[PDB]
């Protein structure tokens, strides 16, 4: 791993769309680093405030900063320190904000689901939102970014407002047959809006943006379901992470379930199972005084049994590059990672960790699922069997409780508390 | 027999919880209406006190 | 087993439903305090 000094104060971080910049957030400041030059700063912004949200615009020109109990939204140009904008329309609150892609605007969410006034950064044009249901959740953009679907609530009913993002007009409003919208996804080819209901009904409502329902992924009425969902970047396969340790993999071409991928418990019950574990070791050669007492990611096939609320449900369903694998895991396996292999539609490369898993990231253009667990180690489901990137003494105690991974999958961002490691892992590829 | 009762009827209890959340959503809608209303006359001009 | 499973599936949904109600309850109290703050 090629990397810089531990960044002090890095309470959180985000990386840019083009992966060239990393924004580090300290409680009162944002530091921007150009990773390609070196992992060094280009600029720093400070605020006499508490930053709760940080976002890069998808051109990596502006940083969106949302301040806490101050209801303040600041937008600053990295490349123009003379362009400073603030949204202080505070009587209604400025509870949150997100960037609106190429519209050069901020959707700023007022409190109490009142308004999500869109504030143009070129001309304000403050169109009202008819009682937005949420801030980030429930707000999504079409694959081409032209349409936006917002979960909204009035008439105490959930419905989706479809807005044309270029003028924010409501263009395709529709009622959804939901109990309580959780989120909204768009098809990769925008031939549908995939609507994710409350976990109570286990259902997905598939609507054509122009006509209402196309299809429904059947509810079971009385069980929790649809814990999480993701779309492949291959034509479009949606993997519905249910709450019953199953993924309903669906070909969105026909909206049919390409079986159920079940986590089970018994590794031996998957016809193609391969099981690995992180295990205690000594260091790689030629290591010296750096000490030992380390671990390595190894195969250990002998292992058969793998280790309401956050129990049972699929915690993740992430598709790999070209979606041959699904990085999943269920809440029932605090210490293990499931990798589903498709086209087999069978479980393979089951990984046990030394401690409970915190999350996963597939590398773009590859696999090598990045597995992190707050251990000062990056574990990978290396395609070539196994890999562990030990983190160094810089930050010897750094846990890595959160991980970001650049789309230009060269740069890794590891976050713990007021602390970040920015680097270039075993990425020769 | 009681498990048949546990099943019979929590579909109903789910329905009663739905009535309660609707009661609350309705009250919140009324309060939201009050917020929009109060804002229309209070902040439309009082926003100037602020700014 | 058949019944208990359903029964759980029902309890599982009920607790999530209750949570919807609770955020609406907390909404309701915060909404009232906002209005009072505005009037005063």
UniProtKB/TrEMBL annotation, chain A:
Cellular component terms per the entry's GO annotation: microtubule organizing center; MWP complex
InterPro entries, per the entry: Centrosome-WD_assoc (IPR052778), WD40/YVTN_repeat-like_dom_sf (IPR015943), WD40_repeat_dom_sf (IPR036322)
Coiled coil: none
PANTHER family: WD REPEAT PROTEIN 8-RELATED (PTHR16220), WD REPEAT-CONTAINING PROTEIN WRAP73 (PTHR16220:SF0)
Full protein name: WD repeat WRAP73-like protein, putative
Originating species: Tetrahymena thermophila (strain SB210)
Organism lineage: Eukaryota, Sar, Alveolata, Ciliophora, Intramacronucleata
UniProtKB/TrEMBL annotation, chain C:
Compartmental location: Cytoplasm, Cytoskeleton, Microtubule organizing center, Centrosome, Centriole
Family membership noted in the UniProt record: Belongs to the CEP135/TSGA10 family.
Name assigned to this protein: Centrosomal protein, putative
Source organism of this protein record: Tetrahymena thermophila (strain SB210)
Residues represented out of the complete protein: 110 to 149 of 380
């Amino acid at each position: 791993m090629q990397f810089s000094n531990i960044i002090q104060g890095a309470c959180s971080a985000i990386f840019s769309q083009d992966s060239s910049l990393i924004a580090i957030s300290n409680g009162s400041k944002i530091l921007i680093k150009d990773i390609n030059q070196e992992l060094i700063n280009r600029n720093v912004y400070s605020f006499q405030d508490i930053i709760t949200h940080m976002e890069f615009s998808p051109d990596n020109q502006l940083i969106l900063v949302v301040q806490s109990n101050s209801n303040t939204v600041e937008v600053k140009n990295f490349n123009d320190e003379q362009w400073i904008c603030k949204i202080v329309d505070q009587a209604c609150g400025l509870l949150h904000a997100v960037w609106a892609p190429d519209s050069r605007s901020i959707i700023t969410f007022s409190d109490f689901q009142m308004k999500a006034t869109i504030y143009s950064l070129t001309d304000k044009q403050q169109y009202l939102i008819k009682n937005p249901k949420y801030t980030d959740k429930g707000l999504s953009f079409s694959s081409d970014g032209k349409f936006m679907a917002l979960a909204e609530r009035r008439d105490i009913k959930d419905y989706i407002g479809i807005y044309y993002t270029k003028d924010w007009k409501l263009v395709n409003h529709f009622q959804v047959d939901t109990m309580d919208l959780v989120d909204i996804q768009w098809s990769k080819d925008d031939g549908s809006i995939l609507v994710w209901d409350s976990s109570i009904n286990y259902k997905f409502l598939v609507y054509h943006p122009s006509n209402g329902l196309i299809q429904r992924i059947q509810p079971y009425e009385y069980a929790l379901g649809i814990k999480c969902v993701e779309l492949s970047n291959t034509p479009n396969f949606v993997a519905i992470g249910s709450y019953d340790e199953k993924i309903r993999l669906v070909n969105t071409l026909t909206w049919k379930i390409i079986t159920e991928l079940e986590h089970k418990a018994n590794i031996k019950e998957y016809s193609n199972a391969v099981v690995y574990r992180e295990q205690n070791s000594t260091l790689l050669n030629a290591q010296h005084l750096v000490d030992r007492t380390t671990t390595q990611f190894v195969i250990d096939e002998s292992i058969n049994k793998l280790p309401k609320s956050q129990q049972s449900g699929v915690t993740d369903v992430t598709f790999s590059f070209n979606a041959n694998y699904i990085a999943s895991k269920s809440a029932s396996f605090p210490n293990a990672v499931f990798i589903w292999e498709v086209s087999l539609l069978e479980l393979r490369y089951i990984i046990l960790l030394q401690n409970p898993v915190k999350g996963f990231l597939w590398s773009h253009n590859s696999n090598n699922l990045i597995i992190y667990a707050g251990s000062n180690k990056i574990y990978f489901w290396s395609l070539d069997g196994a890999s562990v990137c030990e983190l160094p003494q810089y930050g010897k105690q750094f846990s890595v409780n959160k991980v970001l991974w650049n789309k230009n999958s060269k740069c890794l961002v590891l976050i713990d508390r007021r602390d970040a490691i920015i680097g270039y892992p075993p990425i020769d590829l | 027999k009681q498990l048949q009762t546990e099943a019979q009827d929590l579909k109903f209890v789910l329905q009663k919880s739905e009535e309660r959340c609707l009661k609350l959503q309705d009250e919140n809608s009324a309060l939201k209406n009050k917020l929009d209303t109060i804002s229309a006359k209070v902040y439309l001009p009082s926003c100037e006190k602020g700014f």
